[PDB]
Amino acid sequence: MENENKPNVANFEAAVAAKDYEKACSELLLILSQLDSNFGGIHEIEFEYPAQLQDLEQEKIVYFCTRMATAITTLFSDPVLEISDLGVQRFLVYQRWLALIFASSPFVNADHILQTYNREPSSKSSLIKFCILYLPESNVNLNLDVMWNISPELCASLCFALQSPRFVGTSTAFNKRATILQWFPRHLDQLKNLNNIPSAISHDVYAHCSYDTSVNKHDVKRALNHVIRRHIESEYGWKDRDVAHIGYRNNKPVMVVLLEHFHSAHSIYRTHSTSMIAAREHFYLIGLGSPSVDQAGQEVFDEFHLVAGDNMKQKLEFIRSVCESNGAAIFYMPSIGMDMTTIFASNTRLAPIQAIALGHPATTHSDFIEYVIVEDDYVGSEECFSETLLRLPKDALPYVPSALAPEKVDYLLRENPEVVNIGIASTTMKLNPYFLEALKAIRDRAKVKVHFHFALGASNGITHPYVERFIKSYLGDSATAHPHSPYHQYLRILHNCDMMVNPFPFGNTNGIIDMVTLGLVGVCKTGAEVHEHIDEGLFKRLGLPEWLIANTVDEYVERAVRLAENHQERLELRRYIIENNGLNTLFTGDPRPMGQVFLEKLNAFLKE
Numbered sequence: 302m303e304n305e306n307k308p309n310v311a312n313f314e315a316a317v318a319a320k321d322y323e324k325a326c327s328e329l330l331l332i333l334s335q336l337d338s339n340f341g342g343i344h345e346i347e348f349e350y351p352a353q354l355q356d357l358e359q360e361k362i363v364y365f366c367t368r369m370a371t372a373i374t375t376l377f378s379d380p381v382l383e384i385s386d387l388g389v390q391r392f393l394v395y396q397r398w399l400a401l402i403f404a405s406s407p408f409v410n411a412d413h414i415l416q417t418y419n420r421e422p423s424s425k426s427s428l429i430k431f432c433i434l435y436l437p438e439s440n441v442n443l444n445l446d447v448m449w450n451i452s453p454e455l456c457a458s459l460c461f462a463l464q465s466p467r468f469v470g471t472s473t474a475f476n477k478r479a480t481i482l483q484w485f486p487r488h489l490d491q492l493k494n495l496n497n498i499p500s501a502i503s504h505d506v507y508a509h510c511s512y513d514t515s516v517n518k519h520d521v522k523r524a525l526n527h528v529i530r531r532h533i534e535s536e537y538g539w540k541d542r543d544v545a546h547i548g549y550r551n552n553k554p555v556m557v558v559l560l561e562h563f564h565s566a567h568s569i570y571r572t573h574s575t576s577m578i579a580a581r582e583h584f585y586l587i588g589l590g591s592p593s594v595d596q597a598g599q600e601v602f603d604e605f606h607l608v609a610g611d612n613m614k615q616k617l618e619f620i621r622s623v624c625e626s627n628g629a630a631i632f633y634m635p636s637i638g639m640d641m642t643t644i645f646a647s648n649t650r651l652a653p654i655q656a657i658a659l660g661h662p663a664t665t666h667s668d669f670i671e672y673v674i675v676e677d678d679y680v681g682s683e684e685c686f687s688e689t690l691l692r693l694p695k696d697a698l699p700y701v702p703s704a705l706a707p708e709k710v711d712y713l714l715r716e717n718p719e720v721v722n723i724g725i726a727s728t729t730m731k732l733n734p735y736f737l738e739a740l741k742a743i744r745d746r747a748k749v750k751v752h753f754h755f756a757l758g759a760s761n762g763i764t765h766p767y768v769e770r771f772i773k774s775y776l777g778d779s780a781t782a783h784p785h786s787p788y789h790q791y792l793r794i795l796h797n798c799d800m801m802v803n804p805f806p807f808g809n810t811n812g813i814i815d816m817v818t819l820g821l822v823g824v825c826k827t828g829a830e831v832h833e834h835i836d837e838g839l840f841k842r843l844g845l846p847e848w849l850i851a852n853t854v855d856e857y858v859e860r861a862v863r864l865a866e867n868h869q870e871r872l873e874l875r876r877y878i879i880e881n882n883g884l885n886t887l888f889t890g891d892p893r894p895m896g897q898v899f900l901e902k903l904n905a906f907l908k909e
């Protein structure tokens with residue numbers, strides 16, 4: 302009737318008390334949906350609160366979470382409650398938002414509701430219901446092999462949902478995802494289509510694997526590729542392109558670029574636009590993207606078109622029709638994994654040369670992509686990548702500064718401070734028990750008092766209270782969790798610090814430019830994967846001693862403790878960076894190599 306799709310806590314609660322299980326679920330699913338669209342934000346969800354919490358936002362958020370947790374408790378403990386296999390689908394996709402509802406509440410998890418399902422001190426619904434509430438923070442045990450027998454598609458639907466959370470830093474949650482990342486690949490490979498699994502969080506599953514510490518963390522991507530490939534053939538009737546003969550525009554071979562989060566106020570653009578603007582010396586560039594791409598982002602390309610269609614099928618047909626019409630010789634995605642469109646297109650053939658760049662630093666594991674554009678100074682092991690790494694010179698991707706960069710600076714070089722303030726520039730995905738245990742060691746081993754200021758991205762609304770407890774569980778009073786801040790307030794948090802540090806499994810790119818902008822020095826850890834190694838390359842590009850670059854976690858702790866302890870040695874490094882920072886080297890170079898290496902690889906092919 303009216304406002305029948307408006308998320309409202311009182312209506313959810315009313316339907317529960319009234320035992321109208323259908324309205325109760327549908328009202329729950331409205332709220333969960335809103336939390337999804339708002340990335341955990343509780344604004345746009347209608348509720349009232351005691352006056353005391355008016356200006357206490359964290360407490361107002363925990364209040365939201367507790368009120369929802371208690372109503373979900375009443376509902377899901379009712380054995381009368383039945384859920385459609387359609388409800389299980391949607392509920393599982395919002396399971397992460399269910400997870401944050403319980404994790405930011407005093408309850409931590411939904412295990413108290415899970416224990417009511419035990420009638421052995423019963424129904425498919427009971428199981429379904431068990432899976433809906435088997436949250437990343439559950440301490441309940443689960444055999445996944447037993448579950449795969451009972452229901453192969455339901456098990457996959459949960460493994461997908463335990464891979465969807467952006468922040469899984471808790472040992473309890475990180476372990477579930479690490480276990481799933483080892484177990485689930487061989488089982489996902491067995492499915493034939495995406496019709497009975499949580500499709501909509503496929504991309505999450507595809508990208509969040511890169512935040513694990515295992516060497517084979519990317520396995521799950523190949524299996525997903527296969528299923529996607531089986532899906533597009535079977536459900537879309539996908540037929541690949543004749544990539545035998547190419548075509549020409551303005552007497553140059555055609556590069557078709559599929560775009561992903563390519564707005565000019567973003568790193569992706571800042572990091573890969575120069576490389577594509579210069580590839581126009583040898584290619585006609587047709588850009589395919591969303592309306593999110595602004596004019597600057599479209600001006601990269603000779604031609605820009607919006608990816609049209611209402612489903613992946615029509616959109617994949619558009620990308621094909623363009624490549625087919627222009628006989629595109631190169632299919633290029635600067636970023637693969639943020640939007641499903643690229644991931645699906647990665648499992649098709651639309652041009653003889655198909656390549657990605659590392660806008661997301663992870664191998665595709667797709668047979669339909671041959672090359673990976675990457676800078677030499679950022680590669681560790683090339684064996685981390687199914688594709689052939691097209692390693693370009695360290696000057697080959699000149700960056701574009703953001704217009705947000707300050708023009709003026711004040712350097713706080715604290716002579717022997719009583720407390721050493723250490724900055725952390727991290728998003729929730731980058732947080733893990735290994736990183737946090739290393740940070741505990743630094744506090745514990747240092748002969749100087751230290752404080753850790755965390756500037757957290759994606760730590761908003763319901764997300765932040767849960768992460769705050771996580772950080773406090775390791776460092777307590779030696780750590781402040783700042784939620785997401787505007788750039789100028791984010792730099793002020795960092796400005797307050799004496800040195801900085803970053804998560805080792807997945808390093809920082811912008812965080813380092815931020816560190817150096819403020820004349821700060823810090824410690825990173827390098828590794829085989831590019832997302833480990835970038836930090837090393839970027840340190841060297843900017844002029845950072847390699848003693849500040851660790852290979853092991855134990856060294857990471859050693860060198861940071863040293864940076865904290867030796868006040869004057871820290872300040873000499875800061876004064877060195879302040880005077881000879883290579884921040885300008887980041888914004889200069891020759892971006893033409895990429896367009897050249899593509900032409901050679903194409904020309905060789907054309908000749909055979």
Ligand SMILES: O=c1ccn([C@@H]2O[C@H](COP(=O)(O)OP(=O)(O)O[C@H]3O[C@H](CO)[C@@H](O)[C@H](O)[C@H]3O)[C@@H](O)[C@H]2O)c(=O)[nH]1
Pocket residue numbers: 568569572659660661662726727728756757758784785786787788791808809810811812813815832835
């Ligand atoms: O409270 C906050 C927290 C963060 N930020 C901003 O967020 C940025 C950091 O974003 P982040 O996600 O850490 O970017 P990086 O991780 O440094 O770069 C990533 O994105 C690049 C896109 O090209 C990839 O190539 C890199 O591999 C990948 O690490 C900073 O510039 C901050 O200005 C804020 O403004 N306020």
